[PDB]
């Protein structure tokens, strides 16, 4: 609907206050229950004026211009609503016009670490707050993990390309804001194999639905039987996964054991029927031997002898016909049989190599091996999801951070190396990537470290917090897991790919390497094609140079298309992102051992010893319901910049 879609697109209940806003309101909360209705309604239509042109800023005015009778009248309550949805990024995020321009004058000092998503959209949300911010980046770009390779008509993304559903994403304002084109993902993913035949389409759908069978038992066994500790030790997934393929094993040979019994006790029943059989044909010559020499010789003692050597004899052909049906009955049960066996095994060793495609799939998902992943927790943001078709950047994803950018004090090249953080205010000392030699030390009142889960589990540390980190924010980053994903990007002077596909695969023919190259993607409107290194396969890639793993694609492209099709790239770029020592891996999952909690516990600001908080958290890694992804680093930085404005401006 109208407000209620506002609502929706916000991530909000339509209906109902969330315990946020019943926090900021308890006199409406604990009020009357038509307040609460009123409160929903300003909500849900401020939301609703916002998202319907988010390129301007949505000032309390308007709202209260726009609003109908009688919800104009009560002025204050308009205000507190949108001071509450300005402050948390609700309204008024990303890129916009500003109808009323900044103050002059600055209130606090943030120094914001790292010039991603996260410290670029809490650097806009603290600037629009009014508050003197500078982001320090180690690169000579903005947008991190956002990365677009570009030259003359080539666009390829080395970093996040996908966006996820658009409902309920902040994503689908940023890219209204920017002009960034979306193409939803044809869902068409054809598979070959290493020999470059294709899967037929009945086998690839047989799989896959074994596939989600297998899935969907690891979270039965996890949730409703508490499968979850093996040995003292966390089960993963992987793990999980393969014990329920031995038991399908187990359970297709034991069906092969129950069918090879019924065959042979069929067979034993055949055999005694013909030994019978013989002992009667035996007997019925015997006899016959007698109608002949009574028949030879005639009086009456001789002539009732044949009658009755002839109704006896007449009767064992009686008895031996009836075998002999009997013996029809068993045949064909036993024709039957062996012309239906049950299935000889689980997965033929295809089937296997198909299947662990899949699971490459889920590696490339997920970032890492399924063996490192919590088998109860792994999905734990499911109920998070967005709705609507995936998409990919058709014009490269770093049009965002670029626009994001536009208008802040970002120092390129300055590698923070040490945080000190006291009950008095702080400083970031950092050096220059061009001249280490060259070290600049910045105060402030407030630090927003948006640095990745890789580079605080970095040993020796990267960075240097003065005092260090409590144990119980080290323990969260040692748990938590920190992934890896590459890609391979092939620039062509012609396409020889189906242009109608946005992807397809590429079935490898072992489990170890299952994620080597497994998936390529046709999402650009220049000849380019881009193949995933996923899994176990991604970490040791990166030691093998640009032109072998080339080669490994060509080989594999040649496989699929033929060996005349394929030309040889004009332009090739290969990531390294676990090398990389500025991100030192892809993104976050839940690894065995962790939980969602520890995406909490890194959101946590730090408050220094005997106070208020100084030292503050942003990125993927620090939000629970959507790790791992752009719009959860670009959330992170909204809530983030609430956060520290709360503090240092006041709610
Ligand atoms: C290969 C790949 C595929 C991905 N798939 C997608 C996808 O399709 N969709 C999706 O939504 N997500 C995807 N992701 C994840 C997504 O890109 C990230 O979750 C998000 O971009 C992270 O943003 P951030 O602000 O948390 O961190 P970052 O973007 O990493 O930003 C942190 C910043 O800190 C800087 N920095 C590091 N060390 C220092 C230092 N010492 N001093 C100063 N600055 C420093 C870094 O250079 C960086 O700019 C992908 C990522 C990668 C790498
Ligand atoms: O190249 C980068 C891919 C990284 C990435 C990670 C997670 C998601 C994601 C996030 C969700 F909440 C639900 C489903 C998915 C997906 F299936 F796409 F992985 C999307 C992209």
Request: with cysteine; hydrophobic share 40%; aromatic share 8%.
């Amino acid at each position: 609907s109208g407000v209620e879609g506002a609502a929706f697109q916000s991530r909000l209940p339509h209906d109902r206050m969330t315990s946020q806003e019943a926090a900021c309101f308890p006199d409406i909360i604990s009020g009357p229950q038509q307040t609460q209705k009123v409160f929903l309604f300003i909500r849900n239509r401020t939301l609703q004026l916002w998202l319907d042109n988010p390129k301007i800023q949505l000032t309390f005015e308007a709202t209260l211009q726009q609003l109908e009778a009688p919800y104009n009248s009560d002025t204050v309550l308009v205000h507190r609503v949108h001071s509450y949805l300005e402050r948390h990024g609700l309204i008024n995020f990303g890129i916009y016009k500003r109808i009323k321009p900044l103050p002059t004058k600055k209130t606090g000092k943030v120094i914001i670490i790292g010039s991603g998503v996260s410290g670029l959209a809490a650097a806009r949300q603290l600037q629009s707050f009014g508050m003197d911010v500078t982001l320090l980046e180690a690169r000579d770009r903005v947008g991190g993990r956002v990365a677009t390779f570009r030259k003359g008509n080539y666009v390829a993304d080395l970093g996040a390309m996908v966006v996820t559903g658009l409902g309920g994403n902040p994503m689908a304002v940023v890219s209204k804001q920017v002009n960034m084109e979306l193409a939803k993902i044809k869902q068409k993913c054809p598979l070959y194999e290493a020999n470059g035949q294709a899967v037929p389409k009945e086998k690839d759908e047989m799989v896959e639905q074994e596939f989600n069978r297998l899935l969907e038992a690891t979270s039965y066994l996890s949730h409703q039987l508490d499968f979850n500790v093996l040995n003292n030790k966390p089960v993963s997934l992987g793990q999980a996964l393969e014990v329920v393929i031995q038991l399908q094993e187990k359970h297709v040979k034991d069906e092969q054991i129950e069918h090879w019994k019924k065959i042979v006790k069929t067979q034993e029943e055949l055999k005694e029927l013909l030994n019978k059989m013989v002992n009667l044909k035996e007997k019925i010559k015997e006899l016959h031997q007698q109608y002949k020499e009574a028949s030879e010789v005639r009086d009456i003692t001789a002539e009732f002898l044949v009658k009755s050597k002839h109704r006896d004899l007449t009767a064992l052909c009686k008895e031996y016909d009836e075998l002999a049906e009997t013996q029809g009955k068993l045949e064909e049960k036993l024709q039957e049989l062996e012309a239906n066996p049950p299935s000889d095994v689980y997965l033929s060793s295809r089937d296997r190599q198909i299947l662990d495609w899949h699971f490459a799939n889920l590696e490339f998902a997920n970032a890492t091996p399924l063996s490192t992943l919590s088998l109860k927790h792994w999905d734990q943001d499911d109920d998070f999801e967005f709705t609507g078709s995936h998409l990919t950047v058709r014009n490269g994803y770093s049009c965002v951070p670029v626009a994001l950018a536009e208008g802040l004090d970002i120092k390129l090249n300055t590698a923070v190396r040490q945080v000190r953080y006291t009950a008095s205010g702080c400083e970031v000392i950092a050096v220059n990537t061009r001249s280490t030699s060259q070290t600049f030390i910045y105060k402030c009142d407030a630090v927003l470290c948006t640095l990745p889960l890789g580079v605080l589990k970095q040993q020796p540390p990267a960075v240097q917090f003065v005092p260090p980190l409590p144990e119980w924010k080290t323990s969260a980053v040692q748990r938590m897991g920190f992934g890896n994903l590459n890609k391979v990007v092939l620039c062509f002077d012609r396409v020889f790919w189906d242009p109608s596909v946005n992807l397809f695969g590429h079935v490898g023919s072992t489990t170890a390497s299952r994620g080597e190259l497994f998936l390529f993607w046709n999402l650009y409107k220049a000849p380019i094609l881009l193949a995933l290194v996923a899994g176990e396969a991604a970490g040791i890639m990166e030691n093998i140079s640009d032109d072998v793993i080339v080669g490994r694609c060509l080989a594999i492209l040649k496989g699929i298309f033929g060996s005349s099709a394929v030309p040889q790239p004009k332009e090739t770029v290969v990531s390294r992102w676990r090398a990389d020592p500025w991100a030192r891996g892809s993104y976050s999952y839940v690894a065995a051992g962790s939980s969602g909690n520890d995406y909490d516990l890194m959101a946590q600001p730090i408050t220094p010893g005997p106070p208020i908080p100084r030292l503050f958290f942003a990125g993927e890694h620090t939000i629970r319901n959507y790790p791992a992804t752009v719009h959860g680093a670009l959330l992170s930085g909204l809530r983030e910049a609430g956060r520290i404005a709360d503090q240092f401006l006041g709610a």
